[model samples]
Target: LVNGVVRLLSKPWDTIDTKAPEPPEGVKYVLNETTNWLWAFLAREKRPRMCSREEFIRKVNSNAAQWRSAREAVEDPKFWEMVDEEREAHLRGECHTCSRAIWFMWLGARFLEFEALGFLNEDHWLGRKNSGGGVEGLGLQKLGYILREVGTRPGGRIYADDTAGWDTRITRADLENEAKVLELLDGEHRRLARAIIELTYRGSGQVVTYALNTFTNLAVQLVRMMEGEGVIGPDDVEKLTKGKGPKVRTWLSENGEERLSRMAVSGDDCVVKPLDDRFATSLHFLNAMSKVRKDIQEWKPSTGWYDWQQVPFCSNHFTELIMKDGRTLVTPCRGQDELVGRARISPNVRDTACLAKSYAQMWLLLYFHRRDLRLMANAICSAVPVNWVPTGRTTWSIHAGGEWMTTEDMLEVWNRVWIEENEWMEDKTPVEKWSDVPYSGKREDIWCGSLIGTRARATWAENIQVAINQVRSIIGDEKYVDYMSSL
Candidate 1:
């Protein structure tokens, strides 16, 4: 039992170098040239029109007023307090409740005009009604799924004490309060999500390698589409694309469809019209992460390092629907919290960076339930066995020119967003700080072990790889570099 705890908390077994090496000058030059070209082309072709500085301020202030009024409408202090925590979490880039609320609001604003003269229905969120269960119920299932994947449970009877290579304990009372467990899980997930999401946008200058690969892939995708439309025959394709880069670009520039043209020349920013439009790329991202997760579950790193699949080249891509009048008709990433405080209020690059952080947080919160469960597990008993799997860390040192945002910029935005306060908590500080969440404190009330958190992280990373593979298949090996000196 003592050895079990020691093994769980000891230095992880894998030997992944977190620091990526700098590329040689020639590779660096090509990467830089490609990145600069992408910026120039995107700036000219797909840069969304912006409002004047004065109008931007006015819009921000107007949003503030509107949000204040909405707050006034929610008169009940008790119910509103619950909403307040959700709001506090959302602005802090810590949780997804506000994003979910914004999703609901976006739908309502588009499809119907509705007013909320509301009170609390804690049951709806708590899963007491059992109709479809509650939001927290879904949260429970999410945590449950991770454990089930690893052949364990939250706190049921283990039925056998000597279940080697498995978690064997009974500790249901510890994680009994679903809401509090949900809160802790939310924060932890966000942290893990940051690691995985940033993994996509990693490598030299972060965006340099990604820009080159994505644009070249986009060009190839355009050719295939052109071929599909019968606009270009295989003979024409083979003859023209034999040169591999320039001819394909020229052909696509002249013959591709409007969207394909936009896509080929554009930066990482994407456009989504119908909801399903973003589904393909989105699924690919998940597919890659799923593969990674599977590898993680089957891994026995003590023998040797697992040939883990690579995380995607870029998964934190954006999708917006632009209006003919130059306004953004649908910035799908912007939820109510962003709409109120930061959307259109910051620089374009800063906004993208901000979204990256939030989206990363969101993904981690939902997907990384498998990890850090031992924090919960060890809390129940220091001698308790935990399914500890080391999640290999990547070294991201590539710094790019600020045409788009990076994790540093996103982190800056994260710090700033937390400073903006609401009417209810104008004088008070927000919920728990990063360092405040104790690893194993309050063990009596808090359920701290997860049977499946690592699997969640693995699955997420695997799915991202699948997305990258799909793009690679579209752009042949001659056109694409899968594992390069830079990556």
Candidate 2:
């Protein structure tokens, strides 16, 4: 054992919460199955007498074989009915099986271990970053250090540990009954481990897929804007496609090229540069949110209030259905449909005005549209059970891509994307028209508005209500419901 750390050990069959406070004198101190699994997973490599690779592999194979049989049994409805009865009976104290709260109790054990060690006082539970991209506090190493010092002992026995300065004992068990529950939880744990990985991977893919899709559309619009202004020609565009080896063709009509050049050269009155605000950078999102909040709060009937009528509510069809590959393909929301389709793509000078107006009309589209998609993906992630069986605490810091990323690390990545996307807009004052003064856009770095209060933290529901009211006031619920039905 190590100094400054409390050692706790339990068998994999113990209740998930391990200890009952103030046990009667002479009663053994029982630790839970979750605590034992957590200890083994976190401390395996660091333990002085590590389980041999062969032994571990043998156990893994044994578990896999058992899983196959259990998986097959699940095909019968009778098995589920039996389990349901067992669960109900267990709750009524007629028998003991897995606890109803076993899944969350497993998750709670992690935080219990964390708080028990006084690491919470030293550093926040989320983490602290060290230089050189390594974790400093509340990271895997810190959490692992405490668990590594602890060792497990089998059987129900009373013992005195000089280090703990107290009597400790393992619970006497009906080995037969305990073993059955252990077997069930072990299989459930393995199943849930796979489920967590699958759901996380799917959610991350969906988030990145939608983000990249939105970015690609914006990038194309920007390039076309450049082309329309003769900042770059079709030949310049061809260079972009050249290295692809012609799987994708790039072409411009001869007459179209000549006309485009003449339009740029002629200094046509309407050939204004695309507004910097037209880009759906994250920076502009805060400004858009501010406007919505202000208008909604003020209950204004002025020209300052946005014309929500121009932009129809999202069809919302994209987030409801998952593709075979698990991605939810997103289209431009109703607001951006015309912008992405006709206004940005057409080479005509009149379309330039249309593009600028579309951007103005759909100022909130960047945040709301993609946010709806992100909400769906996040829901997927949030709903997943925090079960880690074969894998344990390691899953928290690791990403779907197998990179070492703490939650804070992911937030930093998110900030970097927004910062970079709107970097061009930095140091620029907002202007009424096309004169470039370095367009600076606004961004709300905080992901959750509910986390924004000084005293009482706002609830997610409260934040959602504000959002719902703001939108409902602007577009009306009837129109929104109709839009929802359309797709």
Candidate 3:
């Protein structure tokens, strides 16, 4: 059946005479669907294309005249008064479809820019300019001239009603329908609508992060507006909106009082925990492990410490020493048991302390990474031994040169560290029994902490080496050392 249909379809193109046999109806020379449709539509007697520049101009001028006449009617006191009533209703938050329609019709017609007017013309005349007027006025004048010219051009049959057919005469009802369509479009028009709707409602992780940032920005703006209108008390505003007020107050508050308050006081720490047994037993543990692995992976020599850089003798003994030291000191701990308990309920002081320590370590790692790189650069320039450079150099050498190295260099260095850390972390075996270790909960007592600390120290040492390498790359090693010592 398909073969027969194919043969029949092929017959038209196969036997057609080159110069005779009345060109087949509904068939044109174009190959592509879009071009074929365009040709057919233009060729249709009811929708003939404008044949020349003169005809295009005449049609544009005629349309502009009609639009001008419509404007005149709109400007009449009685017509405008009616429009004002609709606008006032809209401003008052009235949701009536008719009122919305009327408001949109008036607003779109009266306030449409000259650029917008160009979109309606078949020849796009409004973009052209005459010498007598500025760009906007010229656009209007050219539009009028084009409409007039289009009406008189040859080779195209001009219909009286079709002179300005491009300028759609929308009514209040049409305006209402357009508003409804816009609401349906929801800013996305047709593309990615499904994805947008799904992400807007039910997305997780990074998707949730994007939604949060968007909502946070909008909330900040609304809070500012409220503060400006005196709808919220200055101090109460902060409390009511949670932590959103500081961002809003920074932009909207007068006299800097709100901004001062925001900078003066740090926000209280936030603790999050899962709520069910499933979360506590499975998801919670995975979440904690994921965070730990991520932190470990993100560690770099430029930012902080790692376990892989220690000498074999020190590396083997470090975990034992940490555990013993932690037990002797008896500080607060965060272990799997506590993490699970926290996941089942509200995180208490002990859990909070653990989380804080983790975050502090992460922050210190990032800070030290930056500091180490700067120190290494200076040390290389100065010709000091990589191992002999002091930790203090890391902080002090950042401002040594008047100019700083590019942020791209810093990012590259950090990325390298993350890769190295992930490699180190992947090689380690999971501990099965907490009782086997001396310090069950303290980082200083655990193998992980020692590894991290050793890496941190090594990073500082290597940065000095890196700096020397950079100098050698830029200038010869001998010249680089001399240049650094002179500084």
Candidate 4:
């Protein structure tokens, strides 16, 4: 039957004629100005074409045979000996670079999968709920509630663990929670529903890359509609979707429709939308590290010289700030100084930084309230594993930005910093540092404009104390005090 099909297809291919019309006038012919070059310059370079149908089929069959042979080899003792040899070579530093490269690639792919799923969920559902202030207008509140319930459950927490100890098993309850979240969001926000459909259609690949591509495409379509026509509307949605009820086509239609779409979607060109540049940067960093590792592994040392693997060094600490008002922010520890500089370039960055600072302040308050170093260590370790590593003489002496250290090294640094900065608490007496100084009103003649006297520094101190007390209450006295005393 397969042979018959092949013959039927081959007969048409051999006998059929295929042709195209001649080029239009005034089109000059040049070797470098061929269709390939024009296409490369016109559209951002196109993807490589897929194999021809016949070639693809043949290749598939060939691959299947090769796969079977490989599978059999896996069961052979001789094959196991080769694996042992490679393992020994790796231990002897012969294939150290190769092993490290493979490890990084595996880790990168794993992280990408996790991040992608997270992005998909956030962009389509959670973000919409949070954006609309509790999701009542879009019925996302129910979804949010459902997610909170599921995500807080024992199994959910287990699944949420990014470390090695956790099980990969996702429960039926997990599915139920996700489904509920999705259904609620779908019913509430049509734009979110459209987003979900679009993401689903685009198969979840690398989370950051896929999201950026989708968002960029959407932005382009929106820009076209805004420039060419007017706001998109429900009727335009009908036209764009071609009668498909859950399509993103509406954004590309009329003026009102486009305006509505823009309103529904919170992110703009200036802002790093929920699944925007930040995630893209994270993924890029991961990919770059992988490539660097691969390159190092493949590079050969010159004669009589020793070769060392060059692993990209990264700080493990990812700082997250949560405000008293429940707003959460994250600042990945990697490239903090550079990122701070970049923050000055845009309103979005400034706002995000402000939020991060607020979160940090809140964290400081919490830390003061509960001073358990071990708890702090655990939290820091989870976010920044490198911070937990020890830096004793027995291990590599490379400083911060070099190789990873052991846990003991981290503890030593943390202890030294803590003792030096916070030793004032040990003083028993309430020392009278200074008298309360009141600001005098500025004379009109002193300055051209009216000058307002700054508030008392004592008042500022009191306000911070108030904030600290409030945080103490939120965290509870027993746990907070117990944790603090341990430090």
Query: Clash totals for all models, in order?
Result: 39, 3, 34, 25
Candidate 1 C-alpha lDDT tens digits along 85-169: 5444533444433253564333222111011100011122112122111112122112222122212212211110011111111
Decoy 2 TM-score against native: 0.15
What is the TM-score of each predicted model, taking all chains together?
A: 0.23, 0.15, 0.18, 0.19
When sorted by TM-score, best at the front, the candidate numbers are 1, 4, 3, 2
All predictions: root-mean-square deviation over Cα? 27.4, 31.0, 32.9, 28.2
Candidate 3 Cα errors over 4 Å, as ranges:
1-188, 199-208, 224-229, 233-372, 377-487
lDDT per residue (tens digit) for residues 1-487 in model 2: 1100000000110121543132221111111221222223222232112123233233323311123333334344554455455434433334322232453233222222222222211221111121111112221112212111111111111111011111111122211111221222233333322222222222222212222222222222223333333333333321333332221112221222222211111000011112222212211111111111122233222121012112111221111212233322122222222222222232222223222222222222222223222331122112211121111111211212111122222223322322222332242222222121111111221222212332222343234334333433432223222111111
Q: Candidate 1 local accuracy as lDDT?
A: 0.25
- Residue pairs clashing in model 2 are 18-32, 283-442, 428-438
- Per residue, candidate 3 scores C-alpha lDDT tens digits across 1-487 of 1112111111211222221122111111101111222223222232212133233234333321134344344445655455455434443433222343455454322322111112113322111221011112121112222222322222222111110111122122212221221222322222222222232222222212222222222222223223333433333411333444344333333422221111100011001111111211121111111111122232221121122112111001112123222321111212222221222222232222223222222222232222222222234324422222111111110111111122222223333332232232233333232222232233433332222234544554544444445433543333323322211
Q: Give per-residue CA lDDT, model 4, range 63-121, as digits (tens).
A: 11123343344344554454445434433333321243344433322222332233332
Q: State, as a TM-score between 0 and 1, how close model 3 is to the true structure.
A: 0.18
Worst 10 residues of 3 by lDDT: 263-272
